[PDB]
Symmetry: C4
Subunit: 396 residues, 4 copies
């Protein structure tokens, strides 16, 4: 015969009709493999102009992402978003700590509470620039002590006493990219400014319902005042929502609502769509304007991610799934028996182990379906080459 | 493009076809926000002639509503229903305690078991009326003691020794509205009478199956004998049921069956429809006659309420969800660890904190969908502007 | 308007199409009440010729029904089925103990291990017959002892030392009806005979798959040899199955498979249909020949029963649901805390409290839908007057 | 009437349309029995040329199958697959231990760590061949010791000091069949060779996604180099997958993915179809080329097996379900209370009790539906004579 029937449904005929499907309600029928997983290119687009080596993005949650988390996240091919549950000052400070982080040089010396190296952030208190970490790394040995204060040719930078990150994510001026979330109220315009000044690359307008006149004007504002800053619009779950925000000027959309971790109020309130039908719906529209979508919320394993990207998502934001990694802010562990952490509002190794592990699964995931890039995975579903199968309740 | 497709299903095409949907089987896709939540008007109709500032209503359950509960409930914008698991006398007494409650004046002085202020409910045993609480509140100071017996200009009323309730619910004669449930047996006609005399504003005919010749005649009776009393018909779940009761004369319908808390017998018996398809179905009919519907049963969070009202409900009755508030009758707490209360038949702060909190969520709920009033939320669904999405088992 | 739409689905359009519905997958929309529950006539047909006052029937399980259970069961309006996990002799003995039980007279005197009243089952060892229990009940007083051996006018019956059962179930010769289950192997023909001789009214051919050449011939056999004995055919779940058995001669069908309690092997094996689609399907066919159906298995509450009968069932068999009653054979209780009993193979008051309680719920169940008899409930569904509503997984 | 309607759906109309059904989402409506279960012929085809008496096959898991397990498995009518989590040498050794096992003769004497019988695997260190176990079994008695070293007529085989297996599975040269799994990497070609030399009958290419250029070439290779060796292709779940592998030359397909036990990575990853829709789909295609399918994964009880075979499967592979049997490799038991075993990666009696028990249920399963052979069960479903019924979530 050599004919072989036909299987699965096309993403459309499956996600565009009275569904309400979550990541666990379907699977993706496998294809033909003819290459190894390592060749699976994960290059993803965070925003129109910003692009990462991997599609991983950590959440602006007070328990997930902070200066530490963001840095590792960028070095490992992703990006982090500094939350905003702290005075604008301390947050914009966290951005700097990251935007300044040069692989090697100790950042955040100890002047006076934000051992003490006395001085005035460039005023010799107590090392020629342009030198390679090697030169000084040895110089310290003869210094018969440890560190070594660096500075310009006029006694006016920082200190320092297998570190390769081939995929890390820097900006034009070779610096780890960093983002942060803000609100849409007035007070945020200041906060934003401080952040802008601290060197932030992208600002995501943090909100449960981003389709408000408030988020709109906030977009237009930023888009105008700061033409060199990518803005990510409030949380949406439909195209009717994405439209405005896209017209207001967003450079990416953050999809998700009634998914992931809750804080207070009502995560499952009146409104709260399944994170698959949403990602599919919203992306399908967003792509029409070249606006990427971040699948924010509801990721528990690598599989979820593959599925997230396969439906139209360019990147995927995770919170909890990352919280257990060490680079997450906190302390309230019990080593006697089991897992319990604390989350507050208004185990799992270094991210340098975790992220590499995710990328493996994601590449492997793209391999099983015969795809060699997150882009060929998306092209395959919009074409119908990629076939899905729905799973029953009892089934699951 | 600027076109943007179409999403969700209209409430009809979703609730009028072999469904059997509960509050958790669907969500409500969000709209466009362009105003703040506080502007969300919750004015709701309890009955044809009675109207509250909020849509909240507490249940005639021996563990949920009693004189205390009702009072707070009315002051905070709702209304309570005194249960009827007590001799007609003690119940009709509870009504008075509420209908008499004047913000300030101590009610239910201690004559002789229903410190003692001796007298004869107006016969000087042991204060000029028309006086403002301030006048006497000071007078007591000079009285060098505490209280102060008040009375008419003929030595023949009561005593007294940020209290603002802008939204409280009073009747023409400025008094906290109060309701109570009764049965449809003979003995209830007396009970009813006592209640009528105690000043009750609405009487809800308590019953699992309200479409009986018994409830009908009971309606007609009351409607006749007491032309100034709003009657709420037995529990229904279809339009065929609501019809009779509406024709018998009801001024509101109480929808619900096989939902919420159980007592004895069979809550899930042969008959017991999902509280969403029912609220939708019954309301759709009731509105045709100007008869409001109380969505009674199955409310666990604010979300449920928004969904309840969005489907056609004018008000929502809660029992358990309120039981933990302090104004609920009881005592059997354990402060060592967790929740356990007792319910008997034939934690959570003051209601002045809870109700305000519900109203917040409900207003917020109306905000997310772009509605500015519970009425514009209903108008939007009957029009199809409001769009829903069904959720799978596995999904949920 | 006074029109009122249309609701629910007819039993057919709901149970005759790719369903596989269990008792919990649907509910029964309520009707109009215009009479009290006590007027709800539960007269049901166990077999073509045998008819009970109630539709209750206890299972031939070694832990549910035995001489004790059967007796109470018959007195309270039902019937029991003595299991067959004991030599044919002891089982056929249990039948007699029941077929002999006369309200008042002590049965099973103590001759010599099957205080001792010496004799030879009618041979004066150590009272005029036709006497009323009153006569002798007093006679014993003057006898200055206790009991009183009775006998024929030739010194050759039994002894004896608010008992009204208006609904009990007797045969022509005024004796509590009693049934028992047997197998279809050879050895059973003897067993059967002994039973036949002991006075059994109906024999149910105990089997997981009753549509076998074995059960068929076993039917034909009994039907022939004993023309005055009602036979209940092996367990079935389709009409194709019921046909043969009906043609072989059965006088009732026992529907059920992959439901209720398990013993060994595979209750949920390859084959094992939902007990609702089955009861509906099989009954629909059985009724065509005047052959009643016993809904055997899967009953946890009164509701289940109403639903069972409403779909076409004439009677309902229960096992576990009755096991906790006292009349059930056993002992392995712990009064310190909770429920645990033992079931072995190859709390809850007297049945005089339980059965009356079931009948209440069943009558009440028939009331809610507006039916006055189990027969008018069935007539209403086959007509479509009775309307059902399916319930989702997440719903349930 | 004597007509009797129509029930169930044909396997196609049920498994070839947006389903995603697992073994528990449906049941198989019973037929007509007219023969005893013991007459139910279970002869099944493992591969084109290899055929067993039963359809049972144990998994190549480091915790399920090893030399011991395989032997019993073959003797009881099945076959085992030696896993490959050990150097090629120790694995190929396990094959020999099995391919050599002659019912009676002690195998694997103790020369020197792979009491000691000194020698050189045939070089007299320290019995005429062709002798019956009886001859020597007695000879040992006069030997006044125990064992007895056997050898050729030139002092150059083995030793030895109700054993009937009517259904055991041997090859042409009367030896227990044995198989083993290998990978598709280079290193496996050696491993394979050693195995080939050890006498293995079938090699299953162990892989999560068997439709790779790697598995293909690996097939072609083996098929060529070893024309007398049956090859079982990587794990598949569609026909598009099976095609290649079949064209590459496989002699059987191993169906399954996202089912059973997990090890590491993502069992439920992007891809992972329900083991029923898959078995149905893949078999339907495979049978077109005479290529049998092993339903690998997701078996918890006999029922599952019957269902597995009924949908198109020729054999069924089990892992966990067998792990608890004694012939499974291991030790980490607690006899104080309950079940816990250990599974590691890169109770339940002898299999001589278990396998016989499975065969019973499987025969019984075929009986209930009226089938007398696993083949007539398959022929009945492809014809539509065999009818299925879907089960709801809530149902299940
Ligand atoms: N990070 C996320 O993606 C996400 C998702 C869900 C909930 N949340 C959190 O839950 C909290 C409460 O719910 P939310 O998300 O709707 O809060 P939000 O920050 O989106 O704003 C809440 C409401 O206040 C009003 N508002 C906002 N800015 C205003 C302004 N400048 N002037 C006047 N009114 C203004 C709007 O009605 C808005 O709905 C948020 O503060 C947010 O931190 C965040
Ligand atoms: N509050 C509610 O909305 C609600 C809901 C479900 C159950 N329940 C409680 O469960 C209890 C038992 O079930 P119910 O709700 O059907 O009880 P009910 O009060 O509605 O009456 C029970 C039955 O008694 C009969 N009856 C009622 N009044 C009669 C009269 N005057 N004369 C003759 N017969 C009369 C009717 O057959 C009626 O179905 C009720 O008493 C009620 O308190 C209440
Ligand atoms: N009581 C019930 O309704 C019910 C339901 C499910 C299982 N069971 C119990 O499970 C046990 C095992 O399964 P089952 O119900 O199929 O058992 P069964 O009593 O129906 O007989 C089992 C098998 O033995 C064969 N057989 C029966 N009588 C025979 C005869 N006279 N000559 C030759 N062969 C004969 C038939 O193949 C039959 O399928 C049964 O003994 C029964 O007690 C009972
Ligand atoms: N036994 C089963 O049926 C089964 C099912 C699921 C998972 N697993 C286990 O999970 C492990 C990891 O996942 P997997 O099943 O995809 O592993 P695998 O053995 O199928 O190979 C993994 C990947 O390595 C590459 N590869 C394989 N052979 C190669 C070669 N010769 N040259 C270059 N590249 C090659 C391919 O991309 C392949 O997808 C496997 O090793 C397997 O043991 C087994
Ligand atoms: O998918 P997880 O990681 O569980 O959820 C993380 C996401 O959930 C949302 N979220 C986090 N904290 C929250 C508090 N309240 C409401 N939503 C929150 C954000 O969208 C965040 O990116
Ligand atoms: O939704 P909750 O608060 O759980 O349920 C409260 C409602 O349940 C019903 N109810 C309360 N007590 C009951 C006892 N028995 C049967 N129904 C009861 C009433 O309709 C009451 O308003
Ligand atoms: O519905 P319950 O009471 O749980 O189940 C009782 C019924 O289950 C079946 N049954 C009882 N014991 C069994 C052992 N094995 C298989 N089925 C049994 C019989 O049909 C019995 O009437
Ligand atoms: O159905 P059970 O016995 O749970 O699963 C056994 C099957 O699961 C798969 N399997 C076993 N160990 C595994 C580790 N990782 C992934 N799959 C495995 C194999 O297909 C194996 O035959």
């Amino acid at each position: 015969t050599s004919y072989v029937p036909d299987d699965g449904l096309t993403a459309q005929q499956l996600f565009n009709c009275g569904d309400g499907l979550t990541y666990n309600d379907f699977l993706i029928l496998p294809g033909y493999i003819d290459f190894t997983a390592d060749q699976v290119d994960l290059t993803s687009a965070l925003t129109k102009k910003i692009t990462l080596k991997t599609p991983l993005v950590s959440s602006p949650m007070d328990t997930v992402t902070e200066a530490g988390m963001a840095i590792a996240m960028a070095l490992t091919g992703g990006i982090g978003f500094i939350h905003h549950n702290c005075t604008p000052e301390f947050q914009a400070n966290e951005v700097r700590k990251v935007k300044k982080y040069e692989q090697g040089f100790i950042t955040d010396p100890v002047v006076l509470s934000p051992g003490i190296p006395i001085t005035d952030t460039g005023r010799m208190g107590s090392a020629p620039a342009g030198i390679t970490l090697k030169e000084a790394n040895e110089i310290l040995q003869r210094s018969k002590k440890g560190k070594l204060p660096i500075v310009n040719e006029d006694d006016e930078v920082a200190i320092i006493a297998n570190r390769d990150y081939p995929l890390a994510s820097k900006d034009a001026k070779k610096q780890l990219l960093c983002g942060a979330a803000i609100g849409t109220h007035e007070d945020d315009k200041y906060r934003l400014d401080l952040l802008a000044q601290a060197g932030v690359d992208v600002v995501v307008l943090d909100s449960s319902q981003g389709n408000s006149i408030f988020q709109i004007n906030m977009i237009k504002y930023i888009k105008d005042k700061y033409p060199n800053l990518q803005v990510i619009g409030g949380n949406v779950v439909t195209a009717a929502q994405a439209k405005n925000l896209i017209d207001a000027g967003v450079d990416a959309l953050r999809v998700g609502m009634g998914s992931g971790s809750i804080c207070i109020t009502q995560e499952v309130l009146a409104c709260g769509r399944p994170q698959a039908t949403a990602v599919y719906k919203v992306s399908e529209y967003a792509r029409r304007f070249g606006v990427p979508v971040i699948a924010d919320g509801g990721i528990q394993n690598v599989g979820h991610i593959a599925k997230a990207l396969a439906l139209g998502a360019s990147t995927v934001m995770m919170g909890s799934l990352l919280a257990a990694t060490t680079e997450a802010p906190g302390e309230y562990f019990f080593s006697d028996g089991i897992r319990l952490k604390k989350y507050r509002g208004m185990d799992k190794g270094s991210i340098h182990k975790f992220v590499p592990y995710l990328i493996a699964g994601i590449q492997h995931s793209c391999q099983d379906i015969g795809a060699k890039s997150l882009t060929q995975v998306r092209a395959m579903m919009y074409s119908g080459e990629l076939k899905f199968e729905k799973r029953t309740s009892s089934a699951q």
